[PDB]
Amino acid sequence: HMSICTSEEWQGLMQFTLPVRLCKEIELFHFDIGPFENMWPGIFVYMVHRSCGTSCFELEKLCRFIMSVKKNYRRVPYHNWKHAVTVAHCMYAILQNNHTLFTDLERKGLLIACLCHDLDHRGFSNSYLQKFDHPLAALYSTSTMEQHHFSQTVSILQLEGHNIFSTLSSSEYEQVLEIIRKAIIATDLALYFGNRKQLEEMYQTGSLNLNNQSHRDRVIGLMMTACDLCSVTKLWPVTKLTANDIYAEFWAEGDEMKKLGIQPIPMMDRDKKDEVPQGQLGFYNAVAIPCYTTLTQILPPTEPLLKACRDNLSQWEKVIRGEET
Ligand SMILES: Cc1c(Cl)nc(C2CC2)nc1Cl
Numbered sequence: 001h002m003s004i005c006t007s008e009e010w011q012g013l014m015q016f017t018l019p020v021r022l023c024k025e026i027e028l029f030h031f032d033i034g035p036f037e038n039m040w041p042g043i044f045v046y047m048v049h050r051s052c053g054t055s056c057f058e059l060e061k062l063c064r065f066i067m068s069v070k071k072n073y074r075r076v077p078y079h080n081w082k083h084a085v086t087v088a089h090c091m092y093a094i095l096q097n098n099h100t101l102f103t104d105l106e107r108k109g110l111l112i113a114c115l116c117h118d119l120d121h122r123g124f125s126n127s128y129l130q131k132f133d134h135p136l137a138a139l140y141s142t143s144t145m146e147q148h149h150f151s152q153t154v155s156i157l158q159l160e161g162h163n164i165f166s167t168l169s170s171s172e173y174e175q176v177l178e179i180i181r182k183a184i185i186a187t188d189l190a191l192y193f194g195n196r197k198q199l200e201e202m203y204q205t206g207s208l209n210l211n212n213q214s215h216r217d218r219v220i221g222l223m224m225t226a227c228d229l230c231s232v233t234k235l236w237p238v239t240k241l242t243a244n245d246i247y248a249e250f251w252a253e254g255d256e257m258k259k260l261g262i263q264p265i266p267m268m269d270r271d272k273k274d275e276v277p278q279g280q281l282g283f284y285n286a287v288a289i290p291c292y293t294t295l296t297q298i299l300p301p302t303e304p305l306l307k308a309c310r311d312n313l314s315q316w317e318k319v320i321r322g323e324e325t
């Protein structure tokens with residue numbers, strides 16, 4: 001079922017060298033991959049090599065894996081290839097700035113989990129699949145798309161010449177697949193609320209312990225949320241342009257619901273565009289600000305993400321007040 005890259009695609013990626021100018025730029029939390037489309041697969045190779053090393057993965061298998069993953073992201077307005085690389089870049093910036101807190105196996109599993117976290121997204125939410133009793137919802141009762149994204153990741157890894165993790169021992173292979181599974185499932189925002197509440201309690205009571213596996217899993221889960229939502233941490237023009245894509249995707253879902261005779265929620269209704277700024281204020285106060293606040297408490301080097309999120313919240317307030325561009 002997985003689409004496979006052509007020889008020309010992976011061989012082409014093998015010869016790419018990142019321009020020197022961008023090396024200083026890629027290290028920064030606010031970096032926007034937007035203006036460098038041709039370089040996205042190359043940027044991911046670069047990030048894997050800088051975090052793990054050139055010897056970590058067999059270059060040919062890595063390039064084949066990356067180009068087949070790209071091929072399995074769909075032409076949807078938001079949950080696409082650009083999103084995958086954006087999320088992976090945020091993870092790289094988090095991992096770089098907190099490098100030894102994490103094991104070599106965690107750094108490789110997380111960068112891969114980020115690139116694959118929305119694989120084969122169809123442009124439909126878990127709400128749509130569960131309300132219209134789609135077969136995916138029967139198969140995966142909760143975290144429907146996230147279970148699908150993980151199944152797709154394993155399916156790519158099973159393709160001839162794509163198993164980038166085959167050189168790990170039998171124990172490390174099962175360990176990395178678990179790191180990936182947990183990380184991808186954690187991208188379901190429904191799980192985020194409880195995860196952030198549990199982490200805030202652990203941090204406030206002084207019980208949070210990164211040597212404790214269940215605590216590590218939660219910290220990793222919050223990092224996945226922080227990366228998934230990072231369009232809210234970019235410079236305002238970038239954040240605004242990504243919000244346009246977010247809403248284009250939701251509006252297409254809303255259109256499909258309307259065709260089935262079910263009225264969508266206001267956020268998915270293109271005829272309700274005027275409610276977007278109030279909706280964004282709600283999203284930042286309920287989801288993004290608490291997310292980056294808790295992440296900054298646990299990992300102080302991630303503070304630039306919280307600063308940038310606060311700045312964009314401020315910009316959404318300006319939009320509501322009529323002070324826009
Ligand atoms: C990053 C992100 C996500 Cl996942 N969801 C939403 C929904 C309110 C439109 N907004 C943002 Cl800014």
Ligand SMILES: [Mg+2]
Pocket residue numbers: 117118145187188
């Ligand atoms: Mg997702």
Ligand SMILES: [Zn+2]
Pocket residue numbers: 083087117118187228
């Ligand atoms: Zn995502």
